Design a protein around this ligand. Structure first.
Ligand SMILES: Nc1ncnc2c1ncn2[C@@H]1O[C@H](COP(=O)(O)OP(=O)(O)OP(=O)(O)O)[C@@H](O)[C@H]1O
Ligand SMILES: Nc1ncnc2c1ncn2[C@@H]1O[C@H](COP(=O)(O)OP(=O)(O)OP(=O)(O)O)[C@@H](O)[C@H]1O
Ligand SMILES: Nc1ncnc2c1ncn2[C@@H]1O[C@H](COP(=O)(O)OP(=O)(O)OP(=O)(O)O)[C@@H](O)[C@H]1O
Lengths: 1121, 67, 390
């Protein structure tokens, strides 16, 4: 009954919209419902025109706001999107009595707004917008009146909203300082402002939450007042005093006019700006520094002539927040957008239409990320807006529609030049903006003032030491990309000092603990030593519960709690308290996943909160699947995976997310064309901006983790926003990893309990150490580190030993030890030296036999176990008798010992459920051996894919269309319910690298193996894979055109090297073939040997003689024979 | 004209079929056609696996490509 | 710039070598060898123009040595307005390097011509379709149309445009139509067919200091004109300083008409509220150094250079020695605006920019600018010598 009720509440029970939707009204009466619902966009646009702020609401949001005009519940919920500074509407007696800000401040209205069912949302919302402007002005008027009369600052802060008290204080400060400027008497007024600062600072310690916030912001403003007054007091001449005073912002009121809301204006450098009296709440205020003031000066100069404002410079210098603070000072709130390459002419034009009609100030962040074409195209609209404002036009035409121009707007751009993935503005667009460099903020003043606000005993000394220490670290640490000790690091330190004030006592101890927690997790060994030494040089001087939670979580999951592992868990745990964005960087297999899963599970134990975690593979997904996309053909927005998750969390229909944490893990390489889209999500804005105009907030408990192994193509824009955890080395030893792997393999399985003891004793660490140590010296084709090859050893050994359980009950102890020993030796051989050549494998067998002990069961080239007794493959090779015509068959394999060995090990690996990669020269028989092995089986069907340069995930999924079913997360099963699927991947290493050096298809295969599933993009759902295995083959990564595959992929699969057969082998095989042929002409069968010899000789000499150094296509292989 | 063309001609010779040409209902129709053709030849192929195997085998038999 | 000097020298030689005697020819060839650093020697001087050239070369007046040829032979030189006003064509292609754009030259042109100029940037389908419609209209009806950054949409330059231009090669039947195109000399290739049928103009800065201030002054109560004159000198001097990339400013920068315009607006705003003639010169210096021009500057050294130039120009002295040549007295409030404009114009026009203005007027070391100037002369002379050999 859902769809009818949904469109009935929207379209059915409404006889006013029929004058604009008569067709849909009649169509609904007859009733297809979905198509009608998608056909209401024209009316929604009509309603957006009647209240410009509606441009920040999605179509569903407008449907809800238009529908529930009889309840006024849904309209409140959108205040955060429509006004930004306002959280909700405070109703009473079917009338509006006030509004509630984000920080919790309550603004009362001068008059209650009576509401009716007949009054539409846009109507009484316009009334509310005018009333909010009037109420803010009224409180400003009264507060300035009382303060000017001589009321104390401390008895007015508790009566009025923040804006009234701030602006009254500013106007009085301007007037009184100008009167002091009339003469040389600044000492008395400096002392007065100092006394006010002391009074407010002491009052701060005895306050409620709102009063605390108000006093902190006023202290920021009064510290600026005192700094300015002191500078003027210390000028030499009158002209110096006038010169300094002209450069700061002055707050004047037109006390001689009739227009109330426009009575206040701001003077700077001879130019005037108009104060708006828009309600902004109690935002965090910025400490005043010379750079901030000069930025304000340039913005004022640009706005005088209606030119677009612009800030440029390196990342992490405070451009966007300078813009926001300027807006805050002018009594208005700036709307911030995060530009991306998903924007084009239509998106930017629509956003400009919204900003134009609203009368708002808009800031476009990361403006360089727009592609060149749209940067050129939108210059016309930018110029039209500038000309309309300068001339005084009443309307402008955008996207073929004439719209009113509200004469309050402004466009600001913030851009970071010279970063990967950024572009360059064309000249005819740059000429419409006034640029200002923001290269270096005054970090010392910021640190001193923040510490003074926080009540630390000595702000000057601590600020000096902190900033000097950060400079020393930036000067002394090793040369690595992820070393940034700029302003964002200072803010991280200072913010972490806040919860630790009562832990250590408002002194150096808090500062040093914050420094350690912020900085140490991102350093290496050398830089860790440098940090500790420098901290000891510059600075003068109980976790048990969470430690035990970590111990319990690790042991329960089964991971050894090594000292390094616990250290990294503790650092991650402390970092995530205040960081909503963490990056974990370490080598493949080092234990990032173990670290964050263990810490979240320990936190779940500690707090009792639920933890829902989503794992997204950024590179496998395209951006239009990850962040969603608008279909311009219908102008319909359709969510991507991340956008869908965020929307669902924000909706919280059942309240399921109120006592839980939401974790989103991006398990792939950082890519500046993906991650930068989330810049305004990761930093202080905490907002996701979509191209369609929606603005989705980020909940306080919504955390994002990035997992990767490099920071090569990642810019400071991401590194300096996210807290970084660096894994120098693997978190555990080989013994611990073997213990974990063996426990997991065993637990997956009386008899098994004694067999476990036998197996564990067999994996005696003593000899395995030397075996690994001398295994490290072999040549490994397409190799992997020993640490990531242990998994194959343990898994295959457990599978092989358990396969013989049926015949262990009747064996003596020596027999059991011998079978276990031989199986473990063979598994270890193939796990460590499987990707080496034959001679290397035989020498490695020799070393294995040496180190396991002379008295242990010997492993030999072709040893095996038969039903128990010990035998060899070399005695079990049958002959083949072919008929002549059967030489034309594709499915004939003449048996031989080397073939039997490959087939046996391949089938054993496949049964153990280890993904397989075959590697060897062309024609060596990879596909043939893999086809012959599975041809005679009854457990597996085979599906083959041929990979190439321009194949994608779509081809891989389409290859399984006729073999698999989607069965309700969702599951993907083979159509047959008796056999599994083996999905061959031919030439897995050909697919080319993208512009940043990644293979999306290989990452997709990694996701299929590791997570046993994937994301279905159109529906954004999780699909679990049950009975599909992954095998593949490639040539070695030395032939032309082959792309090396990352260790994060190859670690999940056993690698077997297949070389060419020896000369005698080819001679024998093809002598058998010629013997088969000569049945046609038996009178020449005496020549079977010399013909085969001639063919093999000719092949060998052609291969040696005509090499690829002559022509690229001179490839010779046994195929020719 | 495009590299995508190669991606077809590679597949067509790496395997008898091009799976992208017979997705969704296009697959269903193919099987139906095969069934009719199967009935027209006096052959008994019941399942989609048998029919598709016959299809690809005939393709490998009959189609020759000259570059 | 470079190719204009190469052409000037080349044509001078092509004419004189066959017109004049052999000794004249051998002297000029010796001189080109000197400038190119390919050969030493002294011409035979008995021939005062060759002598004057010889004075410049010895004295290391290398840019003067190049300008000798152009000044001696050629007696005329055209600008953008000259080309557009005097042309049988109605399609025009303007080209420049990065961070240089002459759109304002065309807008000033169109206003002076009392023509309606519509400007459309290309790069998107919306602007392309609108541009096609508006191209059709400005032909049946008339008007000026400018297509900016055509290289952004070559797939349309090489199809529709490569076509309509040949069609209008044919019609030549409407007198009030002109299409303008802009492109970058450092960008992609435009199709030869289309460039061949279009009047091509290269836009670049004026090389001379005195020339730059003269042009700026010609583009334009006594305090208003006086401050405008000082600002014109300042703009010319700073723009000239930007040419010495390794000696003038640490980093390469560009200054354009918008910085001049903002400085002019601020100066007028200051003069509006200081009727006592107590001009806040310190505020003028700080604003121009820090905001109007300093906003582009991201280095302390370069900003200090800007501050020095501001302190030199806007000092407020009774008679400023703005260069080693002209001295600029302050105005008399008893004089008329036209009178003061005439006096300032006379001060400007009566002086001479010396051969070594790169040093004396910019106060740079003479050994630093020598490498710059000599290497430019070397490249020009080497190219000319190669062309003359062929
Ligand atoms: N006066 C100030 N007082 C307090 N904090 C400040 C001040 N100025 C800047 N900051 C700090 O600077 C940071 C704001 O930087 P912002 O988010 O604007 O960076 P950005 O230049 O936009 O970055 P990017 O180039 O990476 O996009 C915050 O840490 C803010 O606290
Ligand atoms: N403390 C530990 N004790 C024993 N084994 C451990 C421990 N920590 C990790 N391991 C093992 O080491 C490997 C760790 O890999 P994990 O799944 O954490 O991914 P990773 O190292 O982040 O790699 P990738 O980025 O490729 O996914 C697993 O085999 C895990 O069993
Ligand atoms: N008993 C046998 N032992 C070894 N080789 C044999 C035997 N019987 C046939 N061959 C030949 O060995 C060659 C095996 O190479 P195959 O065609 O399988 O290459 P491939 O593994 O698919 O190679 P690529 O990686 O280049 O695609 C074929 O010529 C096959 O005819």
């Amino acid at each position: 009954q859902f769809y009818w009720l949904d469109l009935y509440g929207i379209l059915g029970e409404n006889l006013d919209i029929q004058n604009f939707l008569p067709l849909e009204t009649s169509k609904f009466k007859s009733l297809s419902l979905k198509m009608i619902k998608s056909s209401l966009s024209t009316f929604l646009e009509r309603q957006r025109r009647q209240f410009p702020r509606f441009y920040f609401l999605g179509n569903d949001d407008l449907l809800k706001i238009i529908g529930s005009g009889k309840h006024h519940d849904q309209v409140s919920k959108f205040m955060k999107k429509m006004f930004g500074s306002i959280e909700s509407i405070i109703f009473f007696e079917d009338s509006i009595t006030g509004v509630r800000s984000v920080e919790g401040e309550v603004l009362n209205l001068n008059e209650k707004i009576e509401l009716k069912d007949s009054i539409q949302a846009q109507e009484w919302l316009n009334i509310l917008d005018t009333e909010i402007k009037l109420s803010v002005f009224t409180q400003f008027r009264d507060c300035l009146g009382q303060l000017k009369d001589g009321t104390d600052i401390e008895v007015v802060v508790s009566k009025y909203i923040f804006q009234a008290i701030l602006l009254s204080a500013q106007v009085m400060w301007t007037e009184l300082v100008e009167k002091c400027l009339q003469t040389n008497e600044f000492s008395k007024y400096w002392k007065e402002v100092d006394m006010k600062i002391k009074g407010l600072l002491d009052k701060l310690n005895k306050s409620s939450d709102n009063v605390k916030k108000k006093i902190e912001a006023l202290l920021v403003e009064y510290l600026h007042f005192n700094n300015v007054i002191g500078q003027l007091k210390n000028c030499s001449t009158k002209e110096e005093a006038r010169l300094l005073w002209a450069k700061v912002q002055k707050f004047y009121q037109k006390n001689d006019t009739l227009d109330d809301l426009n009575s206040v204006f701001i003077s700077q450098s001879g130019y005037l700006l108009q104060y708006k009296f828009e309600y902004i709440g109690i935002p965090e205020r910025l400490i005043y520094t010379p750079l901030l003031l000069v930025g304000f000066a340039t913005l004022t100069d640009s706005l005088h002539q209606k030119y677009g404002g612009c800030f440029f410079g390196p990342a992490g210098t405070g451009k966007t927040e300078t813009v926001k603070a300027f807006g805050q000072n002018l009594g208005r709130v700036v709307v911030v957008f995060n530009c991306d390459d998903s924007f084009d002419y239509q998106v930017l034009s629509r956003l400009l239409v919204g900003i134009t009609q609203i009368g708002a100030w808009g800031c476009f962040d990361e403006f360089n990320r727009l592609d060149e074409k749209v940067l050129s195209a939108v210059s016309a609209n930018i110029q039209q807006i500038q000309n309309g404002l300068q001339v005084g036009k009443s309307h402008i035409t955008l996207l073929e529609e004439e719209t009113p121009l509200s004469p309050h707007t402004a466009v600001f751009i913030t851009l970071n030049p010279g970063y990967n993935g950024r572009s360059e503005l064309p000249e005819n667009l740059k000429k419409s903006f006034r640029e200002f460099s923001m290269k270096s903020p005054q970090s010392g003043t910021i640190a001193e003032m923040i510490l003074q606000i926080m009540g630390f005993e000595d702000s000057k000394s601590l600020a000096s030491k902190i900033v000097h220490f950060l400079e020393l670290l930036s000067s002394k640490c090793s040369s690595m990309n992820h070393y940034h000790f700029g302003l964002r690091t200072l803010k991280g330190v200072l913010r972490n000092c806040s919860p630790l004030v009562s832990e250590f006592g408002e002194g150096e101890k808090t500062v040093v603990e914050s420094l350690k927690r912020v900085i140490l997790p991102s350093l290496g060994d050398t830089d860790e030593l440098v940090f500790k030494d420098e901290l000891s040089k510059i600075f003068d001087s109980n976790s048990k519960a969470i430690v035990q939670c970590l111990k319990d979580a690790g042991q329960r999951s089964g991971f050894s709690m090594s000292e390094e592992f616990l250290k990294k868990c503790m650092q991650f745990y402390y970092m995530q308290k205040t960081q909503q964005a963490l990056i974990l960087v370490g080598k493949a297999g080092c234990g990032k996943t173990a670290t964050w899963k263990t810490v979240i599970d320990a936190m779940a134990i500690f707090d009792g909160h639920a933890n829902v975690v989503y794992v997204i593979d950024t590179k496998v997904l395209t951006k239009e699947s990850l962040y969603g996309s608008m279909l311009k053909a219908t102008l319909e927005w359709r969510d991507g995976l991340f956008t869908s998750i965020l929307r669902r969390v924000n909706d919280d229909i059942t309240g399921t997310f109120k006592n839980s944490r939401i974790w989103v893990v991006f398990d792939s390489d950082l890519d500046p064309e993906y991650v930068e889209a989330m810049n305004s999500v990761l930093d202080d804005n905490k907002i996701l901006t979509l191209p369609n105009g929606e603005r989705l907030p980020i909940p306080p408990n919504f955390r994002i983790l990035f997992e990767t192994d490099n920071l090569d193509h990642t810019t400071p824009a991401t590194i300096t926003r996210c807290g970084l955890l660096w894994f120098s080395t693997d978190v555990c030893s080989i013994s611990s990893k073997i213990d974990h792997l063996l426990n997991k393999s065993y637990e997956a399985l009386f008899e098994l309990d004694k067999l476990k003891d036998l197996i564990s004793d067999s994996f005696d660490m003593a000899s395995l150490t030397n075996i690994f140590t001398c295994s490290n010296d072999l040549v490994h084709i397409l190799g992997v580190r020993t640490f990531n090859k242990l998994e194959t050893a343990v898994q295959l050994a457990v599978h092989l030993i358990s396969s013989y359980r049926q015949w262990f009950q009747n064996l003596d102890d020596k027999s059991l030890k011998d079978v276990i020993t031989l199986l473990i030796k063979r598994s270890l051989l193939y796990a460590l030296a499987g990707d080496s050549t034959g001679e290397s494998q035989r020498a490695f067998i020799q070393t294995i036999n040496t180190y396991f002990g002379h008295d242990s069961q010997e492993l030999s080239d072709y040893s095996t176990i038969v039903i128990l007794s010990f035998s060899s493959f070399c005695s079990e090779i049958p002959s083949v008798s072919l008929e002549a015509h059967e030489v034309m068959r594709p499915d004939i394999v003449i048996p031989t010992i080397d073939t039997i060995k490959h087939e046996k090990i391949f089938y054993d690996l496949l049964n153990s459920k280890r993904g397989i990669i075959l590697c060897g020269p062309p024609g060596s028989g990879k596909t043939m051996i893999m086809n012959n092995a599975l041809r005679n089986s009854s457990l597996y069907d085979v599906v083959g894919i041929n990979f190439s340069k321009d194949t994608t995930t779509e081809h891989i999924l389409s290859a399984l269309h006729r073999h698999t079913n989607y069965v309700t997360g969702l599951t993907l099963l083979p159509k047959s319910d008796i056999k599994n699927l083996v999905l061959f991947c031919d030439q897995i290493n050909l697919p080319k690298l993208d512009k940043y050096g990644s293979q999306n298809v290989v990452l997709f295969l990694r996701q299929l193996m590791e997570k046993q599933g994937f994301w279905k993009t159109p529906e954004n759902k999780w699909v679990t894979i049950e009975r599909i295995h992954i095998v593949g083959a490639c040539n070695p990564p030395t032939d032309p055109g082959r792309i090396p595959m990352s260790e994060r992929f190859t670690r999940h699969a056993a690698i077997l090297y297949l070389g060419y057969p020896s000369g005698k082998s080819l001679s024998q095989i093809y002598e058998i073939y010629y013997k088969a042929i000569f049945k046609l002409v038996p009178e020449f069968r005496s020549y079977t040997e010399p013909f085969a010899r001639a063919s093999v000789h000719l092949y060998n000499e052609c291969k040696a003689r005509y090499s690829t150094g002559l022509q690229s296509h001179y490839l010779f292989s046994p195929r020719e024979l | 004209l495009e590299t995508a063309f190669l991606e077809r001609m590679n597949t067509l010779l790496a395997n008898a079929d091009i799976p992208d040409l017979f997705q969704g209902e296009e697959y269903d129709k193919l099987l139906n056609n095969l069934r009719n053709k199967t009935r027209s030849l006096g052959l008994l192929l019941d399942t989609e696996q048998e029919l598709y195997d016959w299809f690809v085998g005939e393709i490998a038999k009959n189609l020759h490509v000259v570059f | 710039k470079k190719f204009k000097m190469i052409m000037a020298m080349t044509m001078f030689c092509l004419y004189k070598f066959d017109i004049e005697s052999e000794q004249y020819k051998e002297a000029v060839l010796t001189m080109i060898g000197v400038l190119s650093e390919s050969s030493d020697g002294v011409p035979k001087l008995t021939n005062d123009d060759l002598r004057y050239l010889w004075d410049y070369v010895t004295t290391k007046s290398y840019i003067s040595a190049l300008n000798w040829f152009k000044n001696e032979f050629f007696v005329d030189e055209w600008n953008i307005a000259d080309v557009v006003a005097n042309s049988e064509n109605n399609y025009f292609t303007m080209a420049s390097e990065r961070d240089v754009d002459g759109t304002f030259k065309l807008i000033e042109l169109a206003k002076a011509s009392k023509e309606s100029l519509k400007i459309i940037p290309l790069g998107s389908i919306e602007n392309l379709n609108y541009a096609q419609e508006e191209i059709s209209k400005s032909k049946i009806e008339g008007g000026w149309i400018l297509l900016q950054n055509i290289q952004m949409s070559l797939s349309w330059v090489k199809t529709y445009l490569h076509k309509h231009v040949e069609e209008t090669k044919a019609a030549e039947e409407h007198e009030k139509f002109k299409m303008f195109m802009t492109c970058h000399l450092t960008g992609d290739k435009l199709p030869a067919p289309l460039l061949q049928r279009t009047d091509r103009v290269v836009y670049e800065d004026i090389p001379g200091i005195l020339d730059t201030v003269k042009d700026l002054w010609g583009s334009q109560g006594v305090w208003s004109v006086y401050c405008t004159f000082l600002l014109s000198w300042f703009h010319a001097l700073i723009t000239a300083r930007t040419r010495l990339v390794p000696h003038g400013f640490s980093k390469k920068y560009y200054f354009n008409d918008c910085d001049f315009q903002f400085a002019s607006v601020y100066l007028e705003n200051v003069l509006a509220t200081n009727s006592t003639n107590n001009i806040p010169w310190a505020q003028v210096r700080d604003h121009i150094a820090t905001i109007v021009y300093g906003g582009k500057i991201d280095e302390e050294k370069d900003l200090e250079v800007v501050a020095k130039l501001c302190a030199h120009v806007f000092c407020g002295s009774d008679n400023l020695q703005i260069v080693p040549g002209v001295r600029i007295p302050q105005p008399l409030l008893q004089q008329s605006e036209e009178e003061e404009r005439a006096r300032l114009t006379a001060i400007l026009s009566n002086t001479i920019e010396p051969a070594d203005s790169l040093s004396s007027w910019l106060q740079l070391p003479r050994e630093s600018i020598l490498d710059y100037e000599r290497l430019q002369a070397k490249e020009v002379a080497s190219s000319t010598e190669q062309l003359l050999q062929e």
